[PDB]
Amino acid sequence: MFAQLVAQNVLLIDGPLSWYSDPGLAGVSLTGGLSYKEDTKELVVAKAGVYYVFFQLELRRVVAGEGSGSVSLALHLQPLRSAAGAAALALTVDLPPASSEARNSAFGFQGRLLHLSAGQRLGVHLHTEARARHAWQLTQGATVLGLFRVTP
Amino acid sequence: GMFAQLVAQNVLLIDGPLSWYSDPGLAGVSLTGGLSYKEDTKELVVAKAGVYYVFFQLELRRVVAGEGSGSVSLALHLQPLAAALALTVDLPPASSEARNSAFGFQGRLLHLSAGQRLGVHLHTEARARHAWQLTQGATVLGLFRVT
Amino acid sequence: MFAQLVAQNVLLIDGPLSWYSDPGLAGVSLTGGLSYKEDTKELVVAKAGVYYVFFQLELRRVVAGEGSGSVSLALHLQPGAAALALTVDLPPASSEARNSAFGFQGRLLHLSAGQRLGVHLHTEARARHAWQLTQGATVLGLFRVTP
Amino acid sequence: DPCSNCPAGTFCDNNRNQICSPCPPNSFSSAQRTCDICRQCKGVFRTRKECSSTSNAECDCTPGFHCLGAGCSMCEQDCKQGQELTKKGCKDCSFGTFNDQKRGICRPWTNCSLDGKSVLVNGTKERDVVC
Amino acid sequence: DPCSNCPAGTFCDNNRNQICSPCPPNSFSSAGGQRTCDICRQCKGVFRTRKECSSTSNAECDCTPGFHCLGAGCSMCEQDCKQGQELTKKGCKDCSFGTFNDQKRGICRPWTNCSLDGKSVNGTKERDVVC
Amino acid sequence: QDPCSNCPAGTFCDNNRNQICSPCPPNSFSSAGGQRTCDICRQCKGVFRTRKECSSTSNAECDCTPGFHCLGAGCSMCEQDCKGQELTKKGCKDCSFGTFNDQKRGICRPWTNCSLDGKSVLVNGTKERDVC
Ligand SMILES: *[C@@H]1O[C@H](CO)[C@@H](O)[C@H](O)[C@H]1NC(C)=O
């Protein structure tokens, strides 16, 4: 009972990430009672329990000598168990400012245990503090949401 | 199963061991199996021995705009007896590009003994330690058995 | 069915990392159908399935006031895309001590039967001699998820 | 649903079979399978509203600083002589404008030509023209 | 093994018992024996598509006009070189000492030596010497 | 009370081969008894030279290659020999006000006071130089 999706998105655009769900694709894997709703952009968990949920976010500078700021993932649970606006899992990655030394990429990983309800719909939202957001893109095949069950 | 996840109570960056929320009626917190938190010693106590994937997470937030820099460190120490798990997070110095937060995650497999007491210690190179706080509900110690 | 190896290497030298595999060593643990080939520097998985594979990379400044750039791990599967990859910035010496640098990544990998995983180090040197891998800290680990 | 039956100030305790247990100490629910942790207002934050089991606490800044961003996400020290408080924080007074006192607003320089007189000292970011 | 039998444009589908299923939309495999197809490259933002993605091979990107490719496989784009610069393998580096470039997308010519020409003189990275 | 406690330094309580006191494998040590595993031996490479070799009793210890000097506990890192500077616990810090150092690998002497000697200054002192 585990899943791993690969974000389709490449441009840094505020709003929810779309995901590759077909397990014939490299990196992607769905099993058990886990499923992706293409319309709502949500992973749907059938069997309840506690899961180790993790997401990964790699970014690449695509316009040499330009682009700075920050990019953020946020995992939101629908329906809202909290019923406030609080993210279940959250990550922020600094985009370094194009120095002579120059680092042209940026990683970020987080994971933790989440008690998930039956029929819980997990979705991920991208937000970005743009100072030339066009100069950076999501590294393709690298932005990943994954989980696996710990409770039997 | 046999797993735990605690949520640090602390908000001010103060050298010394972190206190933890252990009541699983709290959001984020979960204890199961032979795992327990000793409120007096500030220690997680593992009953059944084995190998566990142990991970901790540390988010920080700038609370005084335009101020604060340096570094903050977690260290997992095992009693009875150098750190089993360790993490350091740089606090960026407040620039035009205002980066007002800082994450840090580490995890690995640890062979734990029966009745092992895990505790986490915070250390901080303060240059205006008052300007930064632990982000609430974000600093987390967790583990689950692999054996 | 899990493993955790500890890199032997200390000097930052482009090319594949050698690993401690003897579980009498602290940190190291092999179980099940998992084994290390000392000649090829490869971890070898017997039973197929899906595993959570993670690696960790800590670095330490060894020449005070010197050294900058970047260091990268890459997990390659035998039999040009890396399965797992990590890069860690080495901060440039300044007033802030900043003598160390961590980096963790993990994800689920579907592994084949008899798959040989190997890890490759690459480094953008600006005084590569001023930094070393922190000993006992650079770690490759995995555990099976599929029954 | 069993849990929907439970109101605010409680949670649907899945360890003790769906029963509406009250929120434990330092926690709340304003609408849940668990209660959320109560906010702490420490350091540069003072508590504005205390944490009930209904709603979360809310912070204000200690005096000498002022709130910034939504929900008072962070504090900023009160704006110095030549500066003015904006949504984005203390920005400096623009050209042609000034601020005499602390925690003030950017008024424009008195034009002495329009008033009849002439300048005996020119204007600046922290001072009006003298005429 | 069974999977080795499957050619390029397909994968060894382990969910549907080793059968050589074709690569799904937006994916490819340029070798045989693969247990999954790889995701097709996207050329968006500053990237334009040079070659479209088949099920045999991956797509390839070029830069939109006003920029030019840099590094292997057009890994990133760089804006076309300004007044005092010349385009190299490593990017727009500035003209060296004794050389200059007048126009955009140009080459570093050397300063006219007026001593060698008879006359007398200074130059710069973006302008020839006047004599 | 415990099987493993019986095993001395230089060995470990091998839980794979039923509690037997196996010797520490290559490149490892244990300077106390009762350990379930041996610790990895330190490596002294790059700017580090080996001062003491790694036994199965104790860990190795490093010194710096010449031209540098140790710094912090266990020679945690090296630092290039001090130029107006003086070597402290915290590293080569500059000579304080009123003090100077002429030569490399030296000590911060104080400026010669010409008033106390009778004469008067024709040029003041500095961090790297003492003239009257
Ligand atoms: C022009 O600049 C160069 C700089 O190297 C200098 O050597 C040369 O003498 C200058 N021309 C004159 C007339 O001084």
Domain F65-132 indexed as CATH 2.10.50.10: yes
CB distance A2 to A31 below 8 Å? yes
Beta-carbon count within 10 A of B108 CB: 21
Enumerate the residues of chain C whose CB falls inside 8 A of the CB of residue F10. none
Encoding tokens for residue F32?
A: 């106390």
CB distance B59 to B137 below 8 Å? no
At D67, is the secondary structure helix, strand, or coil? Answer: strand
For residues C14 and E62, what is the distance between their CA atoms, to the nearest angstrom? 30
Q: Which residue has the tokens 């041996």?
A: F38
Atom of ligand 1 nearest to the CA of E122: 1
Q: Which residue has the tokens 């504090």?
A: D75
CA–CA distance from F47 to each of C18, C60, C91, F50, F59 (Å)?
Answer: 21, 13, 19, 10, 18
Encoding tokens for residue B21?
A: 């929320």
Region A1-152: CATH code:
2.60.120.40
Exposed, middle or buried, E14 (CB in 10 Å: 0-12/13-18/19+)? Answer: middle
Where is E16: in which H helix or E strand?
none
Exposed, middle or buried, A152 (CB in 10 Å: 0-12/13-18/19+)? Answer: exposed
Terminal-residue alpha carbon distance, chain E: 78
Q: Experimental technique used?
A: X-ray
At F6, is the secondary structure helix, strand, or coil? Answer: helix
H-only helix segments in chain B = none
Which chains form contacts with chain B, at 3 or more CB pairs under 8 Å?
A, C, D
For residues B119 and B83, what is the distance between their CA atoms, to the nearest angstrom? 10
Encoding tokens for residue A117?
A: 């309800």
For residues D116 and D131, what is the distance between their CA atoms, to the nearest angstrom? 10
Q: In angstroms, what is the span from residue E110 Cα to ligand 1's centroid?
A: 15
Atom of ligand 1 nearest to the CA of E121: 13
Hey, CA dihedral for C34, C39, C40, C41, is it positive or negative?
Answer: positive
The fold for domain B1-147 equals Jelly Rolls (2.60.120)
CB distance B139 to B73 below 8 Å? no
Report CB contact under 8 Å: A113, B137: no
For residue C87, list its beta bridge partners.
C72
The minimum CA-CA distance between A98 and chain D, rounded to whole Å, is 25
Q: Which amino acid is at D23?
A: C
Encoding tokens for residue B101?
A: 């937060």
E38 — contact with chain C (CB < 8 Å)? yes
Exposed, middle or buried, F42 (CB in 10 Å: 0-12/13-18/19+)? Answer: buried
B66 — contact with chain D (CB < 8 Å)? yes
The minimum CA-CA distance between B81 and chain D, rounded to whole Å, is 33
Beta-carbon count within 10 A of A69 CB: 21
Region D62-131: CATH code:
2.10.50.10
In F17-67, DSSP assigns E strands to 20-23, 28-29, 39-40, 48-52, 61-64
| Residues in Cβ contact with D76 at an 8 Å cutoff, skipping those fewer than 6 apart | B64, B65, B66, D65, D66, D68, D89, D90
For residues F49 and F33, what is the distance between their CA atoms, to the nearest angstrom? 29
Where are the domains positioned within chain F? 1-64, 65-132
For residues A56 and C106, what is the distance between their CA atoms, to the nearest angstrom? 8
Task: Produce one character per residue of E101-131: b if its CB has 16 or more CB atoms within 10 Å, e if not.
Answer: beeeebebeebeeeeeeeeeeebebeeeeee
The fold for domain E64-131 equals Tumor Necrosis Factor Receptor, subunit A; domain 2 (2.10.50)
Where are the domains positioned within chain B? 1-147
**What is the distance, to the nearest Å, from the Cα of residue F99 to the centroid of all Cα atoms in its chain?**
26
Q: Whose CA is nearest to atom 3 of ligand 1?
A: E122
H-only helix segments in chain E = 114-117
| Residues in Cβ contact with A87 at an 8 Å cutoff, skipping those fewer than 6 apart | A74, A75, A76
Cis check for the bond before B80: say yes or no (omega within 30 of 0).
yes
